[PDB]
Amino acid sequence: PMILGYWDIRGLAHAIRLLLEYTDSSYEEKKYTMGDAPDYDRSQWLNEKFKLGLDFPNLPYLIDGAHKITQSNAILCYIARKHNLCGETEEEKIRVDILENQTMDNHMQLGMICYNPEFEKLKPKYLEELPEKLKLYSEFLGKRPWFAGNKITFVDFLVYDVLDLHRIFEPKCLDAFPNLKDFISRFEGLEKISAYMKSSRFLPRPVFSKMAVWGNK
Amino acid sequence: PMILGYWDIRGLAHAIRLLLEYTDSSYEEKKYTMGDAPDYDRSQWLNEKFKLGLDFPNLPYLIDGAHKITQSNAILCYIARKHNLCGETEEEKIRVDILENQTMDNHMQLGMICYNPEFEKLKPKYLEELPEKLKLYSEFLGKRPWFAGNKITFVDFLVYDVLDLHRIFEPKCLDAFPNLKDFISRFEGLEKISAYMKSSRFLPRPVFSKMAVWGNK
Ligand SMILES: N[C@@H](CCC(=O)N[C@@H](CS)C(=O)NCC(=O)O)C(=O)O
Ligand SMILES: N[C@@H](CCC(=O)N[C@@H](CS)C(=O)NCC(=O)O)C(=O)O
Ligand SMILES: [Zn+2]
Numbered sequence: 427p428m429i430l431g432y433w434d435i436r437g438l439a440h441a442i443r444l445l446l447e448y449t450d451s452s453y454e455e456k457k458y459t460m461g462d463a464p465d466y467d468r469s470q471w472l473n474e475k476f477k478l479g480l481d482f483p484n485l486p487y488l489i490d491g492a493h494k495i496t497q498s499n500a501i502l503c504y505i506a507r508k509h510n511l512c513g514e515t516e517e518e519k520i521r522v523d524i525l526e527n528q529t530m531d532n533h534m535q536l537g538m539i540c541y542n543p544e545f546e547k548l549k550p551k552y553l554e555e556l557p558e559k560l561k562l563y564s565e566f567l568g569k570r571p572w573f574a575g576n577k578i579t580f581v582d583f584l585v586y587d588v589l590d591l592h593r594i595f596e597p598k599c600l601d602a603f604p605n606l607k608d609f610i611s612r613f614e615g616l617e618k619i620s621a622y623m624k625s626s627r628f629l630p631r632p633v634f635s636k637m638a639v640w641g642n643k
Numbered sequence: 644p645m646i647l648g649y650w651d652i653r654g655l656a657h658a659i660r661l662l663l664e665y666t667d668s669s670y671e672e673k674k675y676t677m678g679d680a681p682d683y684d685r686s687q688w689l690n691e692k693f694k695l696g697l698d699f700p701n702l703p704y705l706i707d708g709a710h711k712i713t714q715s716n717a718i719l720c721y722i723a724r725k726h727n728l729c730g731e732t733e734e735e736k737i738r739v740d741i742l743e744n745q746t747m748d749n750h751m752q753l754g755m756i757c758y759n760p761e762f763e764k765l766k767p768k769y770l771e772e773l774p775e776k777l778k779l780y781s782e783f784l785g786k787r788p789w790f791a792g793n794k795i796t797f798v799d800f801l802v803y804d805v806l807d808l809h810r811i812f813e814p815k816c817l818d819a820f821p822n823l824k825d826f827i828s829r830f831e832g833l834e835k836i837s838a839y840m841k842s843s844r845f846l847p848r849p850v851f852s853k854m855a856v857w858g859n860k
């Protein structure tokens with residue numbers, strides 16, 4: 427079956443996992459354990475990084491038979507294409523492309539300060555700007571059931587992940603955007619999504635690696 | 644005609660520009676000037692950031708009639724889809740997806756240290772690792788004329804940009820990979836690309852913004 431390599435954490439593999447489950451894909455997981463500080467030993471991965479036959483060795487990676495893939499968004503499109511979740515109309519594809527990258531940006535913005543030793547200092551400013559960021563997603567979604575349009579796409583997994591990570595960071599952050607909350611309900615309401623969230627496989631934390639100042643555990 | 648907003652620099656708009664020219668697309672450019680230090684006044688853009696009707700106000704952006712787009716990779720796919728340069732076969736799309744993101748990573752890696760005030764100190768390490776990064780691209784391309792396969796795709800523009808930025812940073816960097824040099828020859832060898840490189844429109848520098856430590860001018 428398919429095999430998804432990644433750290434023994436949520437991180438970037440989250441949306442993928444969620445996607446794999448929703449698509450009822452058959453897959454295994456090669457979770458890599460990172461050593462404790464101050465070393466943060468990553469040999470478990472490095473002693474296999476270049477033996478998997480990946481073109482650009484990295485985490486996460488996906489191995490589907492002869493197909494060795496890296497880069498989260500690439501892995502998602504790969505899985506999505508097999509289930510027509512990459513968009514169909516012209517406008518659908520545009521929205522998918524924009525979000526695919528937008529979420530990636532917002533995700534890093536968060537991860538940047540969370541990995542920053544001076545995290546406690548930067549937090550006040552980040553929170554001040556967050557409402558605006560969230561608002562943007564709200565404006566974008568509008569009265570649509572999903573982000574791409576009427577049909578769910580892989581970007582809905584990416585958007586969810588981001589929004590979830592934020593209700594976790596600042597719980598009240600979503601209160602001002604009812605439609606976004608409905609999105610989360612609607613998303614977590616999906617059959618296979620709900621079932622998986624209740625299974626032993628569900629790994630919502632640690633949000634980041636051990637090197638993080640926040641969500642490291 | 645189409646309109647491409649961005650800073651009065653190379654940056655992320657480079658590959659786009661290159662793509663637009665090769666596609667013989669009709670377009671204008673809304674270059675935004677950033678103020679000198681220590682303020683780096685960005686008012687010229689901020690006083691118009693939210694009036695363009697962009698979903699996620701950002702630079703670069705592309706306006707094609709009713710279509711307002713942001714996110715470099717999104718803009719590229721938009722332009723590419725109009726000219727069938729987004730890939731066709733399954734393997735083609737995979738490669739496109741991987742590179743589309745890989746290049747973005749390598750580009751930031753460069754941009755990160757060049758914007759880092761302690762640039763001179765980090766440089767030795769970055770150069771030590773670069774050969775391997777380059778090697779990967781070499782390994783990937785192989786005997787193929789283009790990265791996606793036999794046909795040129797928008798990623799060849801993204802890969803070129805990255806490679807170019809590095810021969811500029813470290814000229815001898817490519818000497819060890821002849822196939823990558825042939826790629827640059829073959830790319831700058833394209834009729835519309837060559838013509839554009841010789842026109843008044845060509846803007847190879849500044850590589851980055853004024854806030855940069857390297858390639859700021
Ligand atoms: N754009 C890449 C970024 C991947 C990346 O930097 N992954 C980090 C984890 S978030 C990693 O630990 N990679 C393993 C390594 O650097 O060897 C993606 O989406 O896969
Ligand atoms: N992932 C984005 C990066 C966008 C970005 O941060 N662009 C810079 C220049 S490289 C910018 O000036 N953005 C305007 C802003 O965020 O105000 C893309 O490819 O569009
Ligand atoms: Zn990470």
Ligand SMILES: [Zn+2]
Pocket residue numbers: 654655
């Ligand atoms: Zn930039």
